[PDB]
Amino acid sequence: NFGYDTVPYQRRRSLASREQGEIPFNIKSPRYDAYYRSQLGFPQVVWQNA
Amino acid sequence: MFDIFTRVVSQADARGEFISSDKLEALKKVVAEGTKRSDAVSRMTNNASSIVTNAARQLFADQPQLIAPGGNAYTNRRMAACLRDMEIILRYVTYATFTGDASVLNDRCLNGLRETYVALGVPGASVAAGVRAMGKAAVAIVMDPAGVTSGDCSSLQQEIELYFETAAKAVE
Amino acid sequence: MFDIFTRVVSQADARGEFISSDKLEALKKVVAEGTKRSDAVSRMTNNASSIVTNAARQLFADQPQLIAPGGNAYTNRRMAACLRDMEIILRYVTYATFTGDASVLNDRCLNGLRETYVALGVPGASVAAGVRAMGKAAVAIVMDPAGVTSGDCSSLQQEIELYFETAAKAVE
Amino acid sequence: MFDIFTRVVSQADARGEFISSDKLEALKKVVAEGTKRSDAVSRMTNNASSIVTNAARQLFADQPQLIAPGGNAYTNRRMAACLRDMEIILRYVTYATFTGDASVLNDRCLNGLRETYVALGVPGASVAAGVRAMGKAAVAIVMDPAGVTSGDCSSLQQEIELYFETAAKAVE
Amino acid sequence: MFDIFTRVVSQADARGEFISSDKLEALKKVVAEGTKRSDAVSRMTNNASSIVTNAARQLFADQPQLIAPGGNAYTNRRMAACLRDMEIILRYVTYATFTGDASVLNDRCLNGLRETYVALGVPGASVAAGVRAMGKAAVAIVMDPAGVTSGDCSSLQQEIELYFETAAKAVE
Amino acid sequence: MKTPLTEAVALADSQGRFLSNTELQYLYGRLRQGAFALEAAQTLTAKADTLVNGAAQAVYSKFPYTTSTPGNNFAADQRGKDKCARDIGYYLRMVTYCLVAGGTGPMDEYLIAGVDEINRTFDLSPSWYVEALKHIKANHGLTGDAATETNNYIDYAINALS
Amino acid sequence: MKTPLTEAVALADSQGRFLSNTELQYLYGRLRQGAFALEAAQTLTAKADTLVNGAAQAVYSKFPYTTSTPGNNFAADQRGKDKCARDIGYYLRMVTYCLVAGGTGPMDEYLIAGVDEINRTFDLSPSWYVEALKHIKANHGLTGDAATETNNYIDYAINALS
Amino acid sequence: MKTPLTEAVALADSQGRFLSNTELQYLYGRLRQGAFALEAAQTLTAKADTLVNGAAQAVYSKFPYTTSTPGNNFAADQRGKDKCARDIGYYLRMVTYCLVAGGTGPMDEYLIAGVDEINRTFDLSPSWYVEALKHIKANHGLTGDAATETNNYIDYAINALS
Amino acid sequence: PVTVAASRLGTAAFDQSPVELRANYSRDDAQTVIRAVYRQVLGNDYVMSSERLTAAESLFTNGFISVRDFVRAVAQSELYKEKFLYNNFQTRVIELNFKHLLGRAPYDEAEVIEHLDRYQNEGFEADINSYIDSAEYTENFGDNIVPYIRSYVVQTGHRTVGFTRMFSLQRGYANSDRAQIAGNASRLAQELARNTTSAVVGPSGVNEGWAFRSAADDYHPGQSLGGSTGLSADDQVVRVEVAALSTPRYPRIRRSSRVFFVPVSRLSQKLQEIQRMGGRVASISPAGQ
Numbered sequence A: 001n002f003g004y005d006t007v008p009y010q011r012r013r014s015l016a017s018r019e020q021g022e023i024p025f026n027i028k029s030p031r032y033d034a035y036y037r038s039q040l041g042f043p044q045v046v047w048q049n050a
Numbered sequence B, C, D, E: 001m002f003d004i005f006t007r008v009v010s011q012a013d014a015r016g017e018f019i020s021s022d023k024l025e026a027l028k029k030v031v032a033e034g035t036k037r038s039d040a041v042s043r044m045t046n047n048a049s050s051i052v053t054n055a056a057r058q059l060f061a062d063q064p065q066l067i068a069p070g071g072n073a074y075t076n077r078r079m080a081a082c083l084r085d086m087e088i089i090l091r092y093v094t095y096a097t098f099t100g101d102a103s104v105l106n107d108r109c110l111n112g113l114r115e116t117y118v119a120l121g122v123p124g125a126s127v128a129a130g131v132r133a134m135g136k137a138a139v140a141i142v143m144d145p146a147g148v149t150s151g152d153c154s155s156l157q158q159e160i161e162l163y164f165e166t167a168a169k170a171v172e
Numbered sequence F, G, H: 001m002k003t004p005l006t007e008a009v010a011l012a013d014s015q016g017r018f019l020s021n022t023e024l025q026y027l028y029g030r031l032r033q034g035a036f037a038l039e040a041a042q043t044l045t046a047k048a049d050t051l052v053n054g055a056a057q058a059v060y061s062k063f064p065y066t067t068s069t070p071g072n073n074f075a076a077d078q079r080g081k082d083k084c085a086r087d088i089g090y091y092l093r094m095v096t097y098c099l100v101a102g103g104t105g106p107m108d109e110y111l112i113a114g115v116d117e118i119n120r121t122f123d124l125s126p127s128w129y130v131e132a133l134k135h136i137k138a139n140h141g142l143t144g145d146a147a148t149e150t151n152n153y154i155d156y157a158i159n160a161l162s
Numbered sequence I: 001p002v003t004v005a006a007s008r009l010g011t012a013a014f015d016q017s018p019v020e021l022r023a024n025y026s027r028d029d030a031q032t033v034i035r036a037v038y039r040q041v042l043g044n045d046y047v048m049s050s051e052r053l054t055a056a057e058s059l060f061t062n063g064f065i066s067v068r069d070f071v072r073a074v075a076q077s078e079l080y081k082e083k084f085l086y087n088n089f090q091t092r093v094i095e096l097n098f099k100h101l102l103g104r105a106p107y108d109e110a111e112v113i114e115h116l117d118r119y120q121n122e123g124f125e126a127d128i129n130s131y132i133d134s135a136e137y138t139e140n141f142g143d144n145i146v147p148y149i150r151s152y153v154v155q156t157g158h159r160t161v162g163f164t165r166m167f168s169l170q171r172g173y174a175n176s177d178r179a180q181i182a183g184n185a186s187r188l189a190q191e192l193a194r195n196t197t198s199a200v201v202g203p204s205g206v207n208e209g210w211a212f213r214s215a216a217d218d219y220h221p222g223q224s225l226g227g228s229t230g231l232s233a234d235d236q237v238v239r240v241e242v243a244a245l246s247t248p249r250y251p252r253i254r255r256s257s258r259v260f261f262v263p264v265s266r267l268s269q270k271l272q273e274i275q276r277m278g279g280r281v282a283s284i285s286p287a288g289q
């Protein structure tokens, strides 16, 4: 699909004439998980609710 | 990549001075005839695929050894490869006359056309004659007006003629 | 350059040991059939030029596009060039079957036959078919005895057949 | 890639005519001896790895400078690389005698064997002598029947001998 | 071709200005040690041929596969070719340390040493080790004074060491 | 290049293994095919001129308009008839090579790679060669394993053609 | 690139011999030349601006017409004076390189190869630069072996110039 | 590569002619030579170890000093004896190749091209191998055309060696 | 005088000793030397009898005019201009005159100025005279011997360069010098002014990667910058060149012949990948480290 010289890409994200084809991978996969968020303690809430 | 505006920019940056007034008058002439660039590119892109078939027609009426078995254009796969080669050659001619600079055609065909054609065993003579006949047919469909408002087009004729001879001496 | 004796010498020098006895028995068989090498080389060198004309005859009855104008063998100069190519090809076949080793034909034709034929635009298919027909005619004149004392000649038939197929896959 | 059937097909397509009857008789002979191709390939693939060790045995009894430090086959990594080279060489010999055409061995070893061996500093003499001894041992295990129904096998002997000499003059 | 004086001239002409005073002081140091350039060139040109034989001695004690039949330095003709290669390599080292600039050695050996050695099949490893041992022996005969008036020679030692490493990474 | 020996070699190359017994069975199957495929190619080469001649005449009677209207694909004059008969002769020769090679490789490489593309750019119709191959497979008149192996190759060309 | 070390190397290259003792004497002669040539190049570089300025003014007084008539070679306006003074400065810089290189090679390669040809196609006169070099060799005012070695280089440029 | 068949081929190549009857006579002469040359090479290969052993011992008795003085060419210790015996074995093997090839080509290419040059740069003496070949040509003890053809090759090596 | 893989380099056909014209040559010996002069000066181009110049040739067959002057006569001839001066580029004509008359490839840019400068100053008739009236000419073959390729022997005065530049100049024995892969373009004139040499390739069949030619736009130097710092592998790197890549097709492969730079550790896998593309290997030379 790419070869020697070709930069990779998302192959066939949006099928033609689809309004919403596909989610791009750079958003869909972050570089943390749902697990290192717990190690850092990043969901300290701003307490906007209640 | 390189447009004639960017050609003037690269000359003026290699000199490193501001652009001369007469060169800007030449660019004023260019933007005055940009609609004729549009006229020509539209005309030959309208008829491009039929031009490719007619060029292969004259080539295969001329040299029957290519159709003959053992010939380089003999097989169905290689025949589609031939029409692929001619179609993308005419495509880069249309790119060059749309840009106005031969740098696109040179930098994306001059490099490896001769190389692939000697490495595969492709006879460069047939491609040279075919791109010459294709260029003659392209000038034939570009120059004659069919319901088009009249004007002079000799500079464009010279331009695509130069582009097709650069293609012809590219493949040889 | 390389003879089958010198082939055995070069093998025995690359090993750097004395020659094996069974290889010397093979060479005794070779010098026993050297008169049949003489018989065959004399027979086909007797008829060589007529073989060249008959090979060009079958080639030009087969592919009339070569004689046809615009063809590669069309012009009188190029026609003499064709007969030159076939004559020196059969000459190197006679050299190889006289020496007994294909190294002469390989080292003086394999190198640039394909190269000249793709560089000029020569269709290698016609030369391959022509050297195949020339080899068939050469086996035809070699094998049948005309007032010649009888014997087996299958090894020689295999040898010149191999030489002509090396020529055929040389030009392709 | 190229089989002897496909060899005949490619000749008949380069000529572009139907296949001759005598060539089809030769192919009838080939399919008559296909079981002997099976016999030979099975026999030497049965003993192949021990043949590789015995070839390295005679090579390392012959040339102790390779085992000697500073030699090219000295290190453990390079020793495994040596046995890798010989094993895949015998593997492509088995491929060629299974297919019947030397095109597999040529097109997948002739190209870069000499190239890697001059680029690395590998002495091509040792690989040439080793593939010669390996070919002698391969003929030795193929030809002698052990509980096998009797028959002639001289054509197969000639075939694998030719394959091993093409390997030997491949590496040189 | 290029001397260190002409090196300074070519730098000062590429800048296009007059030569700096400190560079002229460096040239005053150079002409102060020109007699030591004479001392070293005379010393190693006195012993040059024996150095070539001792380098071939250590090479052929080290790698007996070269003397071994099938080796690249095996034959008498190729052995004389080896001694020719080493002699002219040491000759260009003497040229470079006489001139003071490596441009002579580079421009008359760097270009085609690697090229000939990969094209012939010459193992570049043996020539690299041989020119390294030859350079060690050359420093050994240059540095030690035998009835010579004493002085420091570390800059010359660095210079011929650099010249021999440029030769070593030339052939590789 | 669909040859069961070479496909077996390509498989064992991709595995990186030596020759297995699967390949020995593959060779057995290839010999079993060839033992009638060669004689079938022989009688096809004997019949070939009458086959292509009847096939061309049958396609001309099958569609009268290609003889009728002046066009560039169609056989208005005799040169188009020559090119048409050359094409069906090419087809039958590919069938013979496909038979003698033991697989669809000569067919695949020499026809199937770009046939619909040249039919598109020349405005040909593949159904002409479809009904031509139907006339050939009706005309060869053979029996046995060789007949249906050839018929299998012919309808493979038909299916890939349409 | 007339450098006695490199000329010796080119000689021994053409002979194919190792370094001979003739080349050792050649190196001795080059050191003997350089031992005053470097100091002479130093004082020339010190004097160079006054040298080219006096040489330009002396050539302008030497021929009044090049200042007088409007022409393309001549210095009618000040740009021609700039190009003229650039040329004599080029000349004196070549003299310094010629001195420091030990031979006529910088002079030869950088001036002598096509000087009369550009004088022909530009309609210059070499006698202008001749009398300029005469003023320079009168103006440097040195003594000793270095003075006459420089004077030898200067009259070599004069002889090859005319 | 002095082989009368290949020399005939090189001649007819230089002439550009086909095979002439001179070459047929050349082939006849080569067969006439080989018809005893092969059997002579056979008995030489049978005798070869005793030949090189007696030749080495005879050269050692022929000059006692190469055994005596410690030197680099000479056989002071046993490694020099090994290299010496390797050299005479090389010589006799070249003689056998020279015999079986029908010409002096294996001798020429493999010895004669640079033998005196390596004898010069290693300070060997060719007379050692001369008297070695004299002992070999005295020791082979053959009769007939094969004996004198081998003797001709041996004294050719002697003449080109000295 | 190569004798190892002499088959591979194509110089095995040029093995023979040069031809020498005797003091009283016969008519047939004359004709052999004339055929040798025609073959060497026109570069194995065969000649028709209408372009045979039999008149100038008969004067040579007398002996009043020397062999070297006959070489001058064929180079002064109009056919040599029409075959070589006329179709080729003038720098390429200088390149051809180095092979045809001196017998070797040019060594630097100084010789191509000297002959271009001479062409503009005095003409092709004078330029040819300057090739033949040379010390480098007269040493190797004074009056009697034909020109012949001397580049394969060091000859006490070859720079390294001419050995490898000659294989760009001539291919094989069968190849006619008018007729090469590049055709009109000059191989060496790119190589001269950068002072660089391309890898030696042998001619076809014996080597099947002959098809590879370096692109004019892309230099692809041999060393590749740092023993592969950027390729990030510990082992040394070799240059690899492929001839064709035809299996991959048009959308996958833009140009058939390319140069790869690989470490030896990944060499085996890339070679297998090239063979999977059906590509045959031209040259492989050690690159760096």
Ligand SMILES: CCC1=C(C)/C(=C/C2=NC(=C\c3[nH]c(/C=C4\NC(=O)[C@H](C)[C@H]4CC)c(C)c3CCC(=O)O)/C(CCC(=O)O)=C2C)NC1=O
Pocket (backbone or CB within 6 Å): B032, B033, B035, B036, B038, B039, B040, B042, B142, B143, B144, B145, B148, B149, B150, B151, B152, B153, B156
């Ligand atoms: C692609 C959809 C599209 C088209 C076709 C287009 C055409 C176009 N061609 C034009 C002018 C023109 N075009 C031409 C070109 C030609 N006349 C000739 O006689 C030659 C045969 C031919 C040149 C090959 C000339 C001569 C003029 C008028 C004067 C001039 O500008 O040179 C103009 C300027 C005013 C006009 O004439 O309408 C337009 C808009 N614009 C578009 O957006």
Ligand SMILES: CCC1=C(C)/C(=C/C2=NC(=C\c3[nH]c(/C=C4\NC(=O)[C@H](C)[C@H]4CC)c(C)c3CCC(=O)O)/C(CCC(=O)O)=C2C)NC1=O
Pocket (backbone or CB within 6 Å): C032, C033, C035, C036, C038, C039, C040, C042, C142, C143, C144, C145, C148, C149, C150, C151, C152, C153, C156, H024
């Ligand atoms: C050039 C002038 C010239 C010729 C012709 C020549 C021929 C020649 N061919 C000979 C033998 C022979 N030559 C042949 C060869 C053949 N017989 C066949 O049936 C095949 C058709 C053909 C091989 C292609 C055979 C079979 C023998 C005898 C037994 C043998 O040696 O194989 C012999 C040995 C004794 C004899 O039969 O006379 C001579 C002298 N010598 C010469 O100087």
Ligand SMILES: CCC1=C(C)/C(=C/C2=NC(=C\c3[nH]c(/C=C4\NC(=O)[C@H](C)[C@H]4CC)c(C)c3CCC(=O)O)/C(CCC(=O)O)=C2C)NC1=O
Pocket (backbone or CB within 6 Å): D032, D033, D035, D036, D038, D039, D040, D042, D142, D143, D144, D145, D148, D149, D150, D151, D152, D153, D156, F021, F024
């Ligand atoms: C891999 C599992 C497997 C094996 C072994 C196999 C073997 C095999 N070898 C056979 C024939 C044969 N195979 C040979 C081969 C040989 N005989 C010799 O004397 C030579 C030493 C040797 C050749 C190197 C011969 C001569 C025949 C019988 C006649 C012939 O077909 O040539 C046959 C035909 C009938 C028979 O003899 O059984 C079979 C089935 N088939 C298989 O599926």
Ligand SMILES: CCC1=C(C)/C(=C/C2=NC(=C\c3[nH]c(/C=C4\NC(=O)[C@H](C)[C@H]4CC)c(C)c3CCC(=O)O)/C(CCC(=O)O)=C2C)NC1=O
Pocket (backbone or CB within 6 Å): E032, E033, E035, E036, E038, E039, E040, E042, E142, E143, E144, E145, E148, E149, E150, E151, E152, E153, E156, G021, G024
């Ligand atoms: C070729 C015929 C010839 C020779 C030999 C020659 C030699 C020579 N070497 C000299 C100086 C010298 N040469 C050396 C060089 C060395 N001393 C060492 O300790 C090192 C081992 C060696 C450098 C590799 C030194 C150190 C001096 C004196 C101080 C100096 O100039 O560095 C001098 C200056 C005065 C003198 O010492 O005699 C001469 C003339 N001139 C000639 O025409």
Ligand SMILES: CCC1=C(C)/C(=C/C2=NC(=C\c3[nH]c(/C=C4\NC(=O)[C@H](C)[C@H]4CC)c(C)c3CCC(=O)O)/C(CCC(=O)O)=C2C)NC1=O
Pocket (backbone or CB within 6 Å): B060, B067, B074, B075, B076, B079, F059, F066, F072, F073, F074, F075, F076, F080, F081, F083, F084, F085, F087, F088, F090, F091, F094, F110, F111, F118, F122, F124, F128
């Ligand atoms: C080995 C397999 C193979 C095949 C089959 C093949 C076919 C083939 N048929 C072609 C054209 C053609 N084919 C036809 C055929 C027809 N028009 C008719 O009346 C008939 C219905 C039909 C007969 C089948 C015509 C008329 C042309 C030329 C189109 C035109 O003249 O512009 C062309 C274009 C080149 C040319 O002839 O002029 C190819 C490549 N090539 C191959 O390599």
Ligand SMILES: CCC1=C(C)/C(=C/C2=NC(=C\c3[nH]c(/C=C4\NC(=O)[C@H](C)[C@H]4CC)c(C)c3CCC(=O)O)/C(CCC(=O)O)=C2C)NC1=O
Pocket (backbone or CB within 6 Å): G059, G066, G072, G073, G074, G075, G076, G080, G081, G083, G084, G085, G087, G088, G090, G091, G094, G110, G111, G118, G122, G124, G128
């Ligand atoms: C490193 C050695 C070197 C030298 C010497 C050199 C000289 C040189 N002087 C030139 C022109 C010139 N030279 C002059 C000089 C003069 N007219 C006068 O009034 C004076 C008498 C004389 C002052 C010497 C003039 C006026 C031009 C420009 C000619 C014109 O304007 O058309 C040109 C032509 C290019 C140009 O300036 O516009 C060159 C190349 N080039 C070199 O590379």
Ligand SMILES: CCC1=C(C)/C(=C/C2=NC(=C\c3[nH]c(/C=C4\NC(=O)[C@H](C)[C@H]4CC)c(C)c3CCC(=O)O)/C(CCC(=O)O)=C2C)NC1=O
Pocket (backbone or CB within 6 Å): E060, E067, E074, E075, E076, E079, H059, H066, H072, H073, H074, H075, H076, H080, H081, H083, H084, H085, H087, H088, H090, H091, H094, H110, H111, H118, H122, H124, H128
């Ligand atoms: C195929 C033909 C062929 C021959 C003949 C040949 C000879 C040959 N003998 C050599 C050395 C030698 N040759 C000798 C020989 C002798 N000193 C003695 O005591 C004896 C009188 C004499 C025995 C003949 C010695 C001692 C050396 C090594 C010189 C030394 O040790 O430095 C060398 C230098 C490389 C080396 O061994 O170490 C070569 C190339 N090479 C060839 O390719």
Ligand SMILES: CCC1=C(C)/C(=C/C2=NC(=C\c3[nH]c(/C=C4\NC(=O)[C@H](C)[C@H]4CC)c(C)c3CCC(=O)O)/C(CCC(=O)O)=C2C)NC1=O
Pocket (backbone or CB within 6 Å): E066, E071, E072, E073, E074, E078, E079, E081, E082, E083, E085, E086, E088, E089, E108, E109, E113, E116, E120, E122, E123, E124, E126, E127, E130, I001, I002, I003, I004, I152, I153, I154, I158, I159, I160, I161, I163
């Ligand atoms: C002036 C600069 C210059 C250099 C350096 C040069 C080298 C050069 N070395 C060569 C050969 C050679 N070089 C060697 C080298 C060796 N033997 C080995 O096995 C070792 C690895 C190494 C020992 C030192 C050998 C054996 C040959 C002959 C190769 C052959 O016969 O093909 C050749 C081939 C021509 C010949 O046969 O003599 C050239 C042109 N040429 C030049 O113009």
Ligand SMILES: CCC1=C(C)/C(=C/C2=NC(=C\c3[nH]c(/C=C4\NC(=O)[C@H](C)[C@H]4CC)c(C)c3CCC(=O)O)/C(CCC(=O)O)=C2C)NC1=O
Pocket (backbone or CB within 6 Å): C066, C071, C072, C073, C074, C078, C079, C081, C082, C083, C085, C086, C088, C089, C108, C109, C113, C116, C120, C122, C123, C124, C126, C127, C130, I044, I045, I046, I173, I174, I175, I176, I179
């Ligand atoms: C000693 C080994 C050797 C060989 C074999 C060789 C071949 C060779 N064949 C050539 C030409 C040729 N070869 C042919 C061949 C053919 N005509 C066709 O169309 C057919 C496909 C084939 C008929 C047999 C033709 C027409 C030319 C002339 C090409 C041209 O005019 O450009 C040329 C170009 C030079 C010339 O014009 O004569 C060479 C050098 N040269 C050698 O040195």
Ligand SMILES: CCC1=C(C)/C(=C/C2=NC(=C\c3[nH]c(/C=C4\NC(=O)[C@H](C)[C@H]4CC)c(C)c3CCC(=O)O)/C(CCC(=O)O)=C2C)NC1=O
Pocket (backbone or CB within 6 Å): B066, B071, B072, B073, B074, B078, B079, B081, B082, B083, B085, B086, B088, B089, B108, B109, B113, B116, B120, B122, B123, B124, B126, B127, B130, I245, I246, I249, I250, I253, I254, I255, I256
């Ligand atoms: C974007 C710029 C660009 C161009 C122009 C290009 C050309 C190109 N043309 C090719 C083949 C081809 N080109 C031809 C050409 C011809 N048939 C003949 O016989 C005639 C002489 C000529 C008819 C026009 C043929 C037959 C092939 C297939 C060669 C083969 O099968 O090996 C190939 C080999 C790959 C393939 O099989 O498709 C490339 C890469 N590639 C590029 O990236």
Ligand SMILES: CCC1=C(C)/C(=C/C2=NC(=C\c3[nH]c(/C=C4\NC(=O)[C@H](C)[C@H]4CC)c(C)c3CCC(=O)O)/C(CCC(=O)O)=C2C)NC1=O
Pocket (backbone or CB within 6 Å): D066, D071, D072, D073, D074, D078, D079, D081, D082, D083, D085, D086, D088, D089, D108, D109, D113, D116, D120, D122, D123, D124, D126, D127, D130, I264, I265, I267, I268, I271, I272
């Ligand atoms: C499928 C076809 C194919 C072949 C045949 C092939 C060979 C091949 N052999 C290699 C190495 C080698 N080959 C040898 C060979 C030997 N050792 C010696 O000294 C003897 C002369 C010989 C013993 C048999 C050695 C030692 C190496 C390792 C070289 C090194 O470490 O640089 C390498 C370098 C990569 C590695 O380190 O493994 C390749 C790519 N590659 C392929 O893709």
